[PDB]
Design a protein around this ligand. Structure first.
Ligand SMILES: CCNC(=O)c1ccc(Nc2nccc(N3C[C@@H]4C[C@H]3CN4C(=O)CC#N)n2)cc1
Length: 290
């Protein structure tokens, strides 16, 4: 609903670049005085195809209507005359992603489980609104403060059709395969249960403190190798079907690894839902707290 006027927008620094977009930090100062606001602005590249351009308007409308404590706050839009589309303005989350934060801040097991619980609440809310995320990874989880986390990007999020139980994807070149369930890699079908698999991977990233050497692409690529031709995705699919999984992170409890392994059930219907995971993480969080 809210409209940002370009004349009060001052660019500070680039924050990141996703699949089809770019996020930059801006100062929104309607004066020049100290009552300034810092804003995160998502812009689609002016080169983006007609597929991404229609998908962009849908993403804007998705953030315009999602309202939850563990979802980044939509602020408004402004005309991106330079790209003929709009720019998505959101709140600026100063501590960045868990992928950015965790490698430098040794966070305790208790806070990590609180974050995992918060991602589940945000994801159960998203699923309640009949949307699938399709890009749940630690790089998309933003740190508001030491005790608050928010899902910060919806670049691949899609409305699940009323009658259907899944969304048909048709695999691209930028798909985050190392976060995907076998049904996604194989049948090009994304279920609500496919987001739970990606959550399991996010939970693994968190328990490894987002260590780049322990990362899902790093670990899976060690299990597949790099002389595969066009076959990385096939070898990944066959390893996941043989029951090979990401290892137990150093200092990760056995029960948390078992929960991770449950989000990684090959059969999608055997996975818990985000609604089921909330009481479980709540309870597992209360335990490690004391
Ligand atoms: C040098 C290390 N960087 C940091 O520590 C740092 C990074 C971001 C940041 N604040 C911030 N606020 C709001 C949103 C937001 N992003 C939305 C997603 C995830 C992140 C970038 N994204 C995209 O690019 C999506 C596309 N396309 N990031 C503050 C600090």
């Amino acid at each position: 609903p809210t409209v940002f006027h370009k004349r009060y927008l001052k660019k500070i620094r680039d924050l990141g670049e996703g699949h089809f977009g770019k996020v930059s930090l801006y100062c929104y100062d309607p004066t020049n005085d100290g009552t300034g606001e810092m804003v995160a602005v998502k812009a689609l590249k002016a080169d983006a195809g007609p597929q991404h351009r229609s998908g962009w308007k849908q993403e804007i409308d998705i953030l315009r209507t999602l309202y939850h404590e563990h979802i980044i706050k939509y602020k408004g839009c402004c005309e991106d005359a330079g790209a003929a589309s709009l720019q998505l303005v959101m709140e600026y989350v100063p501590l960045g992603s868990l992928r950015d934060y965790l490698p430098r801040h040794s966070i305790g097991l208790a806070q990590l489980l609180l974050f995992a619980q918060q991602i589940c609440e945000g994801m159960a809310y998203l699923h309640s609104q009949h949307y699938i995320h399709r890009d749940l990874a630690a790089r998309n989880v933003l740190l508001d403060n030491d005790r608050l986390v928010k899902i910060g990007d919806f670049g691949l999020a899609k409305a699940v059709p009323e009658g259907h139980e899944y969304y048909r994807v048709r695999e691209d070149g930028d798909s985050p395969v190392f976060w995907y369930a076998p049904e996604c890699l194989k049948e090009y079908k994304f279920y609500y249960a496919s987001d739970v698999w990606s959550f399991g991977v996010t939970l693994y990233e968190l328990l490894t403190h987002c260590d780049s050497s322990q990362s899902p692409p790093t670990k899976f690529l060690e299990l597949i190798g790099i002389a595969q031709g066009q076959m990385t995705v096939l070898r990944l699919t066959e390893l996941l079907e043989r029951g090979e999984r990401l290892p137990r992170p150093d200092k990760c409890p056995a029960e948390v690894y078992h929960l991770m392994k449950n989000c990684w059930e090959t059969e999608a219907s055997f996975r818990p839902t985000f609604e089921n995971l909330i009481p479980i993480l709540k309870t597992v969080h209360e335990k490690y707290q004391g």
